[PDB]
Design a protein around this ligand. Structure first.
Ligand SMILES: Cc1cc2nc3c(=O)[nH]c(=O)nc-3n(C[C@H](O)[C@H](O)[C@H](O)COP(=O)(O)OP(=O)(O)OC[C@H]3O[C@@H](n4cnc5c(N)ncnc54)[C@H](O)[C@@H]3O)c2cc1C
Ligand code: NA
Length: 423
């Protein structure tokens, strides 16, 4: 479909762009370049150093069905070798509870989970295909909570919420089921429930730094792209230090932000303007009365508790002076955005309520997170349109918006992008 001698410009050296280069290269496309704006690779897989070890400012974990990430690891020599994950559940007052042994609610949840599994196995068979170019059932276009209510499966939300809302992906009242069930597909949900999770001692970033190194063309970094245009069957890229012509453009960067430095056409502008994102804030903390385990707080995952700590990550069990990361959301469609200052204050108060008071915040990051569209826009055929635009003026669209904000999903999509359009 596309000629091996094409000059291919990939924008972004996150998992998505690095994967694009890997699978292009392995398909015989040797003239790609990856353009990265920062000084580093891995994107939201970001594993900085502290006291001889690496902590996670972004992604922490995978599941055994992360087949594409296994291929990446087959290529780099990396191994799943991080510390074990364990967790407790806390109420918003900090008291420990065991929802798995709630004799009334527990059965209700697992019964709903059983029923949903059967629906997914029959009625919604195909729901978990990567990307959204296979048009899902209309039901999956509804907010997850409405999708569950339609099917009499409300109580299932209790299991699904913890690795979703706490993981920054937003709230079940508004986020379409399509996203939730592609990420937390039945088998993936089961792996999470069971604690069968991948972590890396050197961070999730490490395998991406290593992938980049294995590439024929490691990413070019500190590349400040000021403008892109696509006249006359060609791509023209202008950066502070140069400007070059390519034959093919691959975007793994945010598509609404792309509008501000490109000759974006009417469709691009109209549709990329609909993209909404999460403001997901992570605080790298030194604390007293070091936790003995990670904690989730479902009470603080309610929209009424927006900006509160939903979860904190106990990474290094042996060293009580190592980093504990905290996680909170600053936005919700039906609420005013929470300010950084006020959310930072909640980090301190909540961690104190939890009995693990903060001595120091050494790093803090609000991420551009989980780009997506509303149920209304999804229903109106957003992905039909954008997937119909694939290749228009030699521009291909990828990254988080085109699949899901998880590093296996975006890598998987980049791989299939090669199969779908290039080979
Ligand atoms: C706190 C947190 C927890 C997470 N937990 C998990 C998890 O448990 N499991 C999981 O699978 N995933 C997890 N993720 C999500 C995962 O990290 C991302 O979905 C993944 O990194 C997406 O890869 P990407 O390449 O599409 O986007 P990104 O990682 O965001 O990378 C995009 C790249 O493009 C670059 N870029 C942006 N603009 C430009 C520009 N204008 N010009 C050039 N380059 C540009 C960026 O600098 C970046 O390198 C987590 C993320 C965070 C923040
Ligand atoms: Na459970």
């Amino acid at each position: 479909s596309i000629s091996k001698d094409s000059r291919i410009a990939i924008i972004g050296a996150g998992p998505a762009g690095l994967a694009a280069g890997m699978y292009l290269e392995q398909a015989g496309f040797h003239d790609y370049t990856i353009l990265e704006r920062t000084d580093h690779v891995g994107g939201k897989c970001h594993s900085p150093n502290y006291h001889g070890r690496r902590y996670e400012m972004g992604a922490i974990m995978g599941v055994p069905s992360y087949d594409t990430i296994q291929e990446i690891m087959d290529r780099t020599g990396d191994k799943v070798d991080g510390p074990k994950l364990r967790r407790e559940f806390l109420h918003e007052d900090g008291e420990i509870y065991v929802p798995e042994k709630d004799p009334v609610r527990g059965p209700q949840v697992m019964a709903a989970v059983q029923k949903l599994g059967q629906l997914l196995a029959t009625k919604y068979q195909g729901y978990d295909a990567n990307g959204h170019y296979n048009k899902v059932h209309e039901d999956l276009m509804l907010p997850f909570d409405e999708f569950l209510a339609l099917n009499g499966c409300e109580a299932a939300r209790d299991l699904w919420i913890n690795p979703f809302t706490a993981f920054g992906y937003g709230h079940f009242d508004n986020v379409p089921a399509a996203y939730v069930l592609k990420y937390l597909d039945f088998v993936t949900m089961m792996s999470f429930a069971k604690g069968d999770l991948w972590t890396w001692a050197d961070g999730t970033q490490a395998m991406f730094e290593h992938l980049n190194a294995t590439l024929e063309h490691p990413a070019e970094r500190n590349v400040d792209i000021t403008r892109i245009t696509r006249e006359d069957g060609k791509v023209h890229i202008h950066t502070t230090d140069w400007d070059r012509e390519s034959d093919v453009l691959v975007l793994t960067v945010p598509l609404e932000k792309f509008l501000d430095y490109s000759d974006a056409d009417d469709d691009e502008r109209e549709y990329f303007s609909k993209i909404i994102h999460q403001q997901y804030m992570v605080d790298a903390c030194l604390v007293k009365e070091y936790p003995t385990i990670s904690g989730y707080v479902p009470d603080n995952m309610r929209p009424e508790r927006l900006g509160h700590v939903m979860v904190y990550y106990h990474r290094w069990a042996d060293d009580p002076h190592q980093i504990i990361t905290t996680y909170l959301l600053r936005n919700h469609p039906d609420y005013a955005d929470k300010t950084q200052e006020e959310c930072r204050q909640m980090v301190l108060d909540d961690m104190e309520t939890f009995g693990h008071p903060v001595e120091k915040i050494i790093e803090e990051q609000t991420w551009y997170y989980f780009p997506h569209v509303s149920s209304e826009d999804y229903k109106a055929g957003w992905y039909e349109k954008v997937e119909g635009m694939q290749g228009r003026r030699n521009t291909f669209y990828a990254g988080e918006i085109m699949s899901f904000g998880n590093f296996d999903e975006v890598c998987h999509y980049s791989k299939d992008l090669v199969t779908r359009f290039f080979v």
